[PDB]
Every structure is written in structure tokens, then in C-alpha cells.
Design an enzyme around this catalytic site. Structure first.
Site, short mmCIF file in Angstrom:
data_model
loop_
_atom_site.label_atom_id
_atom_site.label_comp_id
_atom_site.label_asym_id
_atom_site.label_seq_id
_atom_site.Cartn_x
_atom_site.Cartn_y
_atom_site.Cartn_z
N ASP A 6 -5.49 9.44 4.66
CA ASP A 6 -5.97 8.08 4.41
C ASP A 6 -6.27 7.87 2.94
OD1 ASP A 6 -6.13 7.54 7.33
OD2 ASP A 6 -7.76 9.03 7.23
N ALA A 58 4.07 -1.14 0.63
CA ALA A 58 4.72 -2.03 -0.34
C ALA A 58 6.11 -1.52 -0.70
CB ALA A 58 3.87 -2.16 -1.60
N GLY A 59 6.45 -0.34 -0.19
CA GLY A 59 7.74 0.23 -0.48
C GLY A 59 7.92 0.73 -1.90
N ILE A 60 6.82 1.09 -2.56
CA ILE A 60 6.92 1.59 -3.93
C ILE A 60 6.15 2.88 -4.19
CG2 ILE A 60 7.29 -0.73 -4.81
CD1 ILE A 60 4.44 -0.65 -5.88
N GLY A 61 4.90 2.94 -3.72
CA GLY A 61 4.08 4.12 -3.95
C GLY A 61 4.49 5.34 -3.15
N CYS A 121 6.98 2.19 3.15
CA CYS A 121 5.53 2.36 3.23
C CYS A 121 4.97 0.94 3.20
CB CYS A 121 5.00 3.19 2.06
SG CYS A 121 5.48 2.62 0.41
C1 LIG Z 1 0.40 -7.95 12.04
C2 LIG Z 1 -0.54 -8.97 11.40
C3 LIG Z 1 -0.10 -10.39 11.09
C4 LIG Z 1 0.08 -11.33 12.23
C5 LIG Z 1 -0.92 -11.99 12.88
C6 LIG Z 1 -0.67 -12.92 14.01
O1 LIG Z 1 -0.14 -12.53 15.20
O2 LIG Z 1 -0.94 -14.11 13.88
C7 LIG Z 1 0.15 -10.93 9.87
C8 LIG Z 1 0.06 -10.32 8.49
C9 LIG Z 1 -0.33 -11.38 7.43
C10 LIG Z 1 -0.16 -10.94 5.94
C11 LIG Z 1 1.30 -10.55 5.64
C12 LIG Z 1 -1.15 -9.79 5.61
C13 LIG Z 1 -2.59 -10.25 5.21
C14 LIG Z 1 -3.60 -9.17 5.62
C15 LIG Z 1 -2.75 -10.61 3.69
C16 LIG Z 1 -1.76 -9.90 2.72
C17 LIG Z 1 -2.38 -8.77 1.88
O3 LIG Z 1 -3.32 -8.09 2.67
C18 LIG Z 1 -3.05 -9.30 0.57
C19 LIG Z 1 -1.96 -9.71 -0.46
C20 LIG Z 1 -4.09 -8.37 -0.10
O4 LIG Z 1 -4.93 -8.85 -0.83
C21 LIG Z 1 -4.11 -6.84 0.16
C22 LIG Z 1 -4.86 -6.01 -0.91
O5 LIG Z 1 -6.26 -6.26 -0.78
C23 LIG Z 1 -4.54 -4.48 -0.81
C24 LIG Z 1 -5.30 -3.84 0.40
C25 LIG Z 1 -4.78 -3.71 -2.15
C26 LIG Z 1 -6.21 -3.25 -2.46
O6 LIG Z 1 -3.98 -2.54 -2.22
C27 LIG Z 1 -2.62 -2.63 -2.42
O7 LIG Z 1 -2.06 -3.42 -3.14
C28 LIG Z 1 -1.88 -1.58 -1.58
C29 LIG Z 1 -1.38 -0.35 -2.37
O8 LIG Z 1 -2.50 0.36 -2.87
C30 LIG Z 1 -0.49 0.66 -1.62
C31 LIG Z 1 -1.15 1.39 -0.42
O9 LIG Z 1 -1.60 2.66 -0.51
O10 LIG Z 1 -1.30 0.75 0.72
C32 LIG Z 1 0.84 0.93 -1.97
C33 LIG Z 1 1.57 0.27 -3.14
C34 LIG Z 1 1.74 1.95 -1.22
O11 LIG Z 1 1.62 3.30 -1.32
O12 LIG Z 1 2.70 1.50 -0.43
#
Ligand SMILES: CCC(/C=C/C(=O)O)=C\CC[C@H](C)C[C@@H](C)CC[C@H](O)[C@H](C)C(=O)C[C@@H](O)[C@H](C)[C@@H](C)OC(=O)C[C@@H](O)/C(C(=O)O)=C(\C)C(=O)O
EC number: 3.1.3.48
Length: 254
Positions: A153, A189-192, A187
Site C-alpha cells: 500500500d 495512472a499508467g506511469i508510476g 496501474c
Molecule cells: C468506480 C467509481 C466510479 C463510478 C461511480 C458510479 O457508479 O457512479 C467513478 C470514478 C470517478 C472518477 C474517475 C474518480 C474520482 C474519485 C475523482 C478522480 C481523482 O480521484 C482526482 C483527479 C484526484 O484528485 C485524485 C488524487 O487525490 C490522487 C489520490 C493523488 C493524491 O495521487 C495521485 O495522483 C496518484 C499517484 O500517486 C499514483 C498512485 O500511486 O496511485 C500513480 C501515478 C501510480 O503509481 O499509478
């Protein structure tokens, strides 16, 4: 010579998990033959990564991009998929379920997917799935999904052993399928995490064709993959994990 226009278009804004993490246009996976009713249908956040065996670096599926994901897989002829994350980690969605439950089958748009068999291993689950175009059961092919699920995690694995044994398997699976398409890696974002695996897999194939003595240049390899998709390998833990992985592989061969 390095734009990301398509990914920025107003019509693809909902097709990216992060507005700021987009695919370069020149290495962008262009999706042909999509619903003519949709404003844009040739887009998906994914880039072809070819060493200079190819790879497809992408994000985990979004609820509205699942069909695009399969269209990509079908078109590119990929037969192996590497999922480097759980569907949800630390209460955050990294990839929506895009495969059917055990022994079940779903239709994602014009694509039919049958979950033939699921088998577990130490760090991963293997899902044998059958992909075909609805009404045309003359296009069916098996797609092997390798689901790594023990990744920590926080940070990266403390030992490279797991990932290496994992990639060795993915490796032989890919070479056992005649002219299989690019290997899809994804993953959140598909980069890290995604970049780390690919970079490792790339360096390991070199140590394969070459020997445990060939010139191995990590920064050059990384830089190289980043020119095809920016962000590949984002943390220092990841960065150092790559070094460790390579050295571990060397010491293993001996
Ligand atoms: C299945 C759910 C659903 C349907 C619901 C329904 O049936 O109706 C819809 C999804 C909606 C939508 C696409 C998702 C929604 C949560 C909002 C989008 C993002 O959540 C938003 C930009 C955001 O603000 C996220 C950030 O707060 C994020 C944590 C930050 C700190 O962190 C990163 O950028 C990730 C990065 O560290 C990372 C990782 O190790 O996860 C990377 C590159 C990696 O290794 O891949």
C-alpha cells in the site's frame, strides 16, 4: 514533436483518471471503428512503448472506458495483460473491474469476454479470458491477465524477488503465443508502477539476449520510455527498486 492535444480535447476529459496525466499524440493508441454516435471514439489514455516486444502503458479502467479498453486490446492483438494494482488501494479506485467473474462472461460493447479459468500464485492471480467480437466468433483469442496483487500500500516491495518471478512468467507466456501483440501494463495512472515494471522487463530482456555483462544504462532506458509516455517511474523508491531488480536478476542467473 511532443504534443498531447488529443488527450486535452473537451470530449476526452472524462476518459482520463487525471486531467494532468495524458498520452503523447505520436505514441498514442488510436482506436478505430468505434460507435459513430460518440463525439470522439478513437481515444484512450494509453501509449505504445517500444524499446529502442512492445508494451502498452495505460491507466486502470474507468467506469466509462472499459469498452475502450477492450477495443484497444482487440485491435492491437494483445494477448497478455499486466495489472499492477488492486481495483482499490487505500480506499482509492485505481481500476474498475473490466473482466467477468469466475466462469462468467460479459459483453462490453461489441466485445465478448469469457472468464475461462482463474488460478492463484504467491503474488498474483492468472485469469484466462476469451475475447471475441460479438456475432463474429471467428475473431476469438485468449488473453492472459496477470494480476499482481501483493504490491505494498505504501512504497515498493522491499525485495525484487516477487516481481522478477512474476515477469519471468509473463515473459514465457508472451513468447508462447504466435505473434502476440503488445503487452498491456496498467496501474492507477499508467506511469508510476506501470513504468517501473516495463523498464525492468525491458532491462531484463537485454540481460537475456546479451549476457550478465552487457552495458546496462538505467537512466537512458527510463529517459527512452519517457519520450513515449511522460512520467514513467515517478518515485525514488520505484527508481531504486529498478536497480535492485536488475542486480537481483543478475545474481539469480549466476
Ligand atoms: C468506480 C467509481 C466510479 C463510478 C461511480 C458510479 O457508479 O457512479 C467513478 C470514478 C470517478 C472518477 C474517475 C474518480 C474520482 C474519485 C475523482 C478522480 C481523482 O480521484 C482526482 C483527479 C484526484 O484528485 C485524485 C488524487 O487525490 C490522487 C489520490 C493523488 C493524491 O495521487 C495521485 O495522483 C496518484 C499517484 O500517486 C499514483 C498512485 O500511486 O496511485 C500513480 C501515478 C501510480 O503509481 O499509478
Amino acid at each position: 514533436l511532443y504534443s498531447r492535444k488529443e488527450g486535452q480535447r473537451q470530449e476526452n476529459k472524462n476518459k482520463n483518471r487525471y486531467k494532468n496525466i495524458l498520452p503523447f499524440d505520436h505514441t498514442r493508441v488510436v482506436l478505430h471503428d468505434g460507435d459513430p454516435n460518440e463525439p470522439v471514439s478513437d481515444y484512450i489514455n494509453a501509449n505504445i512503448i517500444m524499446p529502442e516486444k512492445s508494451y502498452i502503458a495505460t491507466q486502470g479502467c474507468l467506469q466509462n472506458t472499459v469498452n475502450d479498453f477492450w477495443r484497444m486490446v482487440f485491435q492491437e492483438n494483445s494477448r497478455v495483460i499486466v495489472m499492477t494494482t488492486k481495483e482499490v488501494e487505500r480506499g482509492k479506485s485505481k481500476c474498475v473491474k473490466y473482466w467477468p467473474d469466475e466462469y462468467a462472461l460479459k459483453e462490453y460493447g461489441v466485445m465478448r469476454v469469457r472468464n475461462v479459468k482463474e488460478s492463484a500464485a504467491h503474488d498474483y492471480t492468472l485469469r484466462e479470458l476469451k475475447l471475441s467480437k460479438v456475432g463474429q466468433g471467428n475473431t476469438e483469442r485468449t488473453v492472459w491477465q496477470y494480476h499482481f496483487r501483493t504490491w505494498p500500500d505504501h512504497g515498493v516491495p522491499s525485495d525484487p524477488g516477487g516481481v522478477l518471478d512474476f515477469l519471468e512468467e509473463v515473459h514465457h507466456k508472451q513468447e508462447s503465443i504466435m505473434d502476440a501483440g503488445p503487452v498491456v501494463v496498467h496501474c492507477s495512472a499508467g506511469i508510476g508502477r506501470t513504468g517501473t515494471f516495463i523498464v525492468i522487463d525491458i532491462l531484463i530482456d537485454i540481460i537475456r539476449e546479451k549476457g550478465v555483462d552487457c552495458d546496462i544504462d538505467v537512466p537512458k532506458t527510463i529517459q527512452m520510455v519517457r519520450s513515449q509516455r511522460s512520467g514513467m517511474v515517478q518515485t525514488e523508491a520505484q527508481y531504486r527498486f529498478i536497480y535492485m531488480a536488475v542486480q537481483h536478476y543478475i545474481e539469480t542467473l549466476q
